[PDB]
Amino acid sequence: AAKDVKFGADARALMLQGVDLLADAVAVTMGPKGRTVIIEQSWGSPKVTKDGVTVAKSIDLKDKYKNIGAKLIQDVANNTNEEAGDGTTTATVLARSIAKEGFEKISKGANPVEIRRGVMLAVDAVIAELKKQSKPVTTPEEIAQVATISANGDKEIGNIISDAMKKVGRKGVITVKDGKTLNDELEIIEGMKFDRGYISPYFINTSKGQKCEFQDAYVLLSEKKISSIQSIVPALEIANAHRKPLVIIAEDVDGEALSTLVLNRLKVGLQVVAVKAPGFGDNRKNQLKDMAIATGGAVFGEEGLTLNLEDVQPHDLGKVGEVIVTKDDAMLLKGKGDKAQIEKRIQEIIEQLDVTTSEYEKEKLNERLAKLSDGVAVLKVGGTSDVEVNEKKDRVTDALNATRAAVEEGIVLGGGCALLRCIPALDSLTPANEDQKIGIEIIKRTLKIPAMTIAKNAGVEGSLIVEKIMQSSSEVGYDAMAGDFVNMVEKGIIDPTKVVRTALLDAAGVASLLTTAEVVVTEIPKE
Amino acid sequence: AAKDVKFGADARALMLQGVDLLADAVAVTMGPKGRTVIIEQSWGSPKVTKDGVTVAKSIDLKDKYKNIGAKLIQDVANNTNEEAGDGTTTATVLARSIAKEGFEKISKGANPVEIRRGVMLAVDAVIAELKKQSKPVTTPEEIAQVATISANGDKEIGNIISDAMKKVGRKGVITVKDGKTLNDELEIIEGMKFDRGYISPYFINTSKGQKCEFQDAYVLLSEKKISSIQSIVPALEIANAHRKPLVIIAEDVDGEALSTLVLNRLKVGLQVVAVKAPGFGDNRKNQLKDMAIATGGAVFGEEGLTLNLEDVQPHDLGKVGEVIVTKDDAMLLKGKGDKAQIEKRIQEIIEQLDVTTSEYEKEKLNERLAKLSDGVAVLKVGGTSDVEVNEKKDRVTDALNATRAAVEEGIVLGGGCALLRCIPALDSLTPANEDQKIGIEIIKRTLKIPAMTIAKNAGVEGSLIVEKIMQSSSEVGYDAMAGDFVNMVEKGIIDPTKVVRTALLDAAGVASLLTTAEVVVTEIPKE
Amino acid sequence: AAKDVKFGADARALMLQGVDLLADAVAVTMGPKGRTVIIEQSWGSPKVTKDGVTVAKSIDLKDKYKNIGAKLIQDVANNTNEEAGDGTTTATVLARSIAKEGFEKISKGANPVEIRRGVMLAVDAVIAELKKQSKPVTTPEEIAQVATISANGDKEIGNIISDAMKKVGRKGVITVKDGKTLNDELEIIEGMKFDRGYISPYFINTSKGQKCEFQDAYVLLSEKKISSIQSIVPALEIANAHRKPLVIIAEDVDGEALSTLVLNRLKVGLQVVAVKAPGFGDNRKNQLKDMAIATGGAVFGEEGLTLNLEDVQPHDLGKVGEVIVTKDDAMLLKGKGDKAQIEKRIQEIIEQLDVTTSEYEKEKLNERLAKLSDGVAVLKVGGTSDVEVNEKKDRVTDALNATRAAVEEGIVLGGGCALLRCIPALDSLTPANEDQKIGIEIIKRTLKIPAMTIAKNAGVEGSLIVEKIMQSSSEVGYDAMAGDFVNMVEKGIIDPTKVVRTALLDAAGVASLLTTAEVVVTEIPKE
């Protein structure tokens, strides 16, 4: 596969052209006054999006050289998204500025490696300054303000997010789902729910809603399948002797056992129900064990210390205040397990969370903890059409990620003033040689880009706005939407520290490396 | 794959061109004086259709940028069709008008998102006004008028639909089927007809029509296959002892039992007949249960509380006044069950219908309810060729959907006056800022489009007609077909509220979102 | 396939063009002030590499004739990289210089073969001079200096490598792996770790970290799978009688023995744990023998002297001070085996090393030796993105290779002065005839190329710098990074002798042979 090689300024110019194209495409979506971007899909309706990463990841150029810069900027945006979940457009603009300055400052005697060293030094100093400047979050109003700002200045989403986290705690489980109505909703699921329905409709006893209901019902857990008639008779004997319903959670119920259950329920009125055990693999056993602790019962069929169903006892069956089972989902509301073991199980789960880190394992552990502790909340966003629902879901997810980040770390002035306030810190550095001085100057000049872009999107001269902000007091910033200088903290225009620092770090790291190239090798295009 | 990017005015112009082409193609079929569109088909005779959604879906543009607008308008039309079943052309024209007005107002200082918010606020106010203006449907005359207007001014369609809904109630089951004669027909099916034929022709006892006819006949319902000769003798013995016919509905009849039945009938004249069970699986079980309840009999072979056929009893067999069985269908006319049991079964059916919604499940539950309660109505449309039959079926389906919507909610003045009468409600709004004022003005100017289009299709000046309508009383409108101003309600020109509000909402929602684009990303055409 | 033939100066010019292109692409990355080269990747992000062999291996030219020279230079670079691991760019530049000089001197009467003979003679003399000038490496500071120089002036890598070699000896096992933090980290592994996890979670006894810890635990080693319950019980009585925990390392634990162990641990609290054996095939058996020797136990199931598990003895069980086992890895820290046998094992392994040499076999034997003697060290390189991590990892690997080469042999002045100091040796040769004199002259003039290139990359006249170096004292060269003449050894600018001599030998060997061509036969391009 023959290859083409270009030397010197030509390759840099072409790469800069590609970077500028992608950055210009992504920059028009920045600020409260930004505008959306339409992407043409290959199978159906186009996407109308306002996310920087989504726009960046859907641009590939014909020329083989510009595509290199496009790919590098895509990597910057994707890394920022993966690390923080927000602040991708800021990363893109910062990377573009750094790349432009680096390409402009090269000369015959310059040493790009030392320039990169100086850039990294300046970035480290700026990040330290940001960490000094931060402040924690304590009030729900701050949470609501962060959520509102991250969601394109929409107040309803912020209020919904604040209510959700208030109800299920700040570090709970929250998810976004497609709605079917015009207006969004918040639904909170409490107790134990595992999305399974009764096997046979004959167990229905409450027609309204086609649901089966009990009160103070014995709970039976069986890890393995229930096949032999001899393996159930003691349980029904106990339930009928103590005049209490019985809910049978087992891997499955065989034809003979199911026939016995249904016939007894029909002809004697004995209150009994059966549901499939939830989860697959080790998750099934884990959930069964957790239910056993929650309801104070015992599980049958464990490989270790196996217990036989033929010798069930009244103390082995857990007690639950309420049980609801329908076509699709089942709910155990009020367990009766002892508190100490519940707390110990919670402690073990949280300890396990820190042991092994994988998205699936971590998510499963968090879901189990939420089920066993406080519950989960579901956000359903509505709209007139699918395009609207998707576009709103993007913003809602951005708001959730930003709010979580603001819970983890403090908050700083929004609107790009957080970076502008760090310029003074760069005047205390002592560059070792000339190249590090060049790098420090590059970072100092680049720190102003975000606020300038936000002002530019509003249709006003950004440079004058920045000049005015720098000379004003410490807490004064520019409110793009209103178009006047206000007290940032009071008005609630705030941003998490994690997002800002991650964006700056990733952008600088990638762009500085890019600016040291001298030769570019590509493949000749095929016919 | 390489991709192309366009900025600002060029993308807007191309997308507007595509939208204009699609809407111009679709809008020539609006109003009573509209003309048809011929769609070329790749496997037979072309379609000659006057339906907006079909024309919208049958258009794809060679260029990529215009295709985006075409696809968005297709989404609008499809959403309106699925939600309401009518009013697709109105939605298309409203979407075009909103898109054009939004594009005409974008400038450097403009803020498209706030314009969208203002548009949504205005649309909500207008829909509230419409719901205020709505009035309920009370008499069959309004049903006939709605059906007639929905079917492009065809009185026979309205009369047929009104008669059908009178016969089978206002919420019965009505289905449209192709015809084989010049004149359309209405057929009512009462009792329980399930389209199953006698297993052996030897049971026929009436030459004319080759139909098996019985009076005051026992019915034997079996969920399991009848094969054993032992299991079938007792029922025949009871029937012979009581000297009454007997119809067997079962999963299937085996060689031995079938041979016994046929030979007994032939050599002794015993009155018997057997048919397959209708439906499959759980549906079959439910159908058998419903017949058992209706006929006052008992079902054998049920998995829960199973009853075996060897111990059949006289009180376990239902009685039906009349039984008709032929090669294609079998009908049970007059059941002999308990009225309270029937009422409870209907209550359960409707309650289940109120639990979970799916087209298949809802359709099946409705079919069972109609069979057990009032029956169904079948409409057969006539024509000289398939093209005419399809073109008329389109209108008949539109009429059914419009009449159903009119039954569900109120009715408002037709001919576009319903929207024209809502303009004053927008004059009571107070925009928060300039952008919301621009959006409100956009909707205020858009609300006149339907009347203007209807007038234009008639060959007169739309603006003059709209102006004259606006200065008249609150009850006067324009009769497009006749060509004079009349009392809209008195002449019977009315439309459902649901159609109007759905069209307005969908069109505004999609168009306003479309009008906030700044960039378009599309794939370069391949080779 | 049709082929094309070229004669004389045409072919030489074409091949020289190809060689010049490749060498120009590769030489811009030489010295402390070099610049990086970007390679376009077919499936993802491009590489940003400052590695000579990587650049050379990724250039192919459309023209058939140039590809010959490109391929020959690729061969030079690959051979140098394989033999030494460093000094690829020096080899490439030397090869270009030799090829150009040889091509320049071919005439009607010249004899290329004799020129090659003279070139080889001069190269041998220069290599002898280098070996005479070398000195051994003694202090850790020299190791740090060599690592820093080879790592492109990065002191952190040098310090890390020096510390690692101090900890795990100067001939231990060091591996480079991708990290997950901003800063590179050094992790040292001691004892014996084979990355195997506990068979069943029930064995966990330390809640924090979900680990299993024992002190002074009996060790049972079984080459073959332990399945029959009778084959594991006697060890259990032994352990429960001596009141010590037992660790069962075997090929696998079947459901029977596994059930016995887990049940006893759960119900009686007996301290036991089991793990799979490491590695496959003969490696597994060798590892088991090594553990047996270290712990002082005996391996069960050996093909020779097959010792059945039914007769375990208190003295046949290994003893280990500490045991840690978790979901992924297990560790035995302080074995109680006899020292003398440990030595005999070590001498046996090292004796086996020298007999057979295959990369897999050498790696495995070295791993076993390190595990049994001193342990291993892991170098984790940090970074913000994949490109940065790869770029740093290249330099780290080059530093490791250079440090190993400098430990194996001596060190010589860096910056190209080592070769410059060897020119006087060539003045003592007496060419047999004219052609050998021409070859000696070619090598004499070529020896200056590395220093000239390094000076050129810094942005100064290379000729003046090399001339001033040659006329100065022996211990004075040019410091490119600072830009002044200094004492090379004192400043710590040194290189290994192996790298220099290998690069010179390979470059001369290939270029001299290339410079004796007269006809080039190439395949005609296809369609």
Ligand SMILES: Nc1ncnc2c1ncn2[C@@H]1O[C@H](COP(=O)(O)OP(=O)(O)OP(=O)(O)O)[C@@H](O)[C@H]1O
């Ligand atoms: N009303 C406002 N006035 C001033 N600055 C604002 C205002 N609202 C948001 N900002 C600032 O603008 C930026 C928010 O824009 P945006 O959400 O597009 O940025 P991003 O996080 O980089 O990208 P995205 O969220 O699309 O991935 C943040 O700097 C936020 O501080």
Ligand SMILES: Nc1ncnc2c1ncn2[C@@H]1O[C@H](COP(=O)(O)OP(=O)(O)OP(=O)(O)O)[C@@H](O)[C@H]1O
């Ligand atoms: N004789 C009439 N005079 C005035 N307006 C009329 C008359 N007949 C129908 N209309 C109005 O014209 C529209 C009916 O046309 P049409 O059926 O093409 O529109 P649509 O409901 O948007 O689409 P579709 O063809 O799918 O039903 C409705 O607004 C109806 O109120």
Ligand SMILES: Nc1ncnc2c1ncn2[C@@H]1O[C@H](COP(=O)(O)OP(=O)(O)OP(=O)(O)O)[C@@H](O)[C@H]1O
């Ligand atoms: N500060 C310095 N001043 C002078 N010479 C230096 C300095 N640092 C390194 N050198 C010399 O420059 C050369 C380093 O270049 P480099 O490591 O790129 O060459 P290479 O070993 O041929 O290639 P590579 O390591 O990429 O495979 C070596 O000769 C080293 O001795």
